[PDB]
């Protein structure tokens, strides 16, 4: 593909899950501690439709990485795994689009 800066995490989050306080804290926390195993992760952006406020677009989340070096060694080990019962589709995302949440 092409390394940019931030990592992408798709096919591992549903709108029916990113609506609960328990499920949310569970994903953000876990995904964080995990992403911080291959390198350094600045932050994490995971939509949270307010009672269905951001549903039209919900389903894709990711984390803001520091370097593409660890971002590569990370996604290379996250691809093929399983968030729970579905193959996780990790990719690369541009820090710019991330900031604006343009979703890439």
């Amino acid at each position: 593909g092409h390394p940019t800066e931030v990592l992408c995490l798709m096919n591992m989050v549903l709108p029916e899950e990113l609506l609960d306080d328990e499920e949310y804290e569970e994903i953000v926390e876990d995904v964080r501690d995990e992403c911080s195993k291959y390198g350094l992760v600045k932050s994490i952006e995971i939509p949270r439709p307010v009672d269905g406020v951001e549903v039209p677009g919900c389903g894709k989340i990711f984390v803001e990485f520091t370097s593409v070096f660890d971002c590569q060694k990370a996604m290379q080990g996250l691809t093929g795994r399983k968030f729970a019962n579905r193959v996780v589709v990790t990719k690369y995302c541009d820090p710019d689009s991330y900031h604006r949440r343009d979703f890439w």
Binding site: E29, E34, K82, A84
Partner: peptide
């Protein structure tokens, strides 16, 4: 830091 070894979130089988 918790949530490190309890519930696998990257299985396959």
């Amino acid at each position: 830091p918790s949530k490190k070894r309890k519930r696998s979130r990257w299985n396959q089988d």
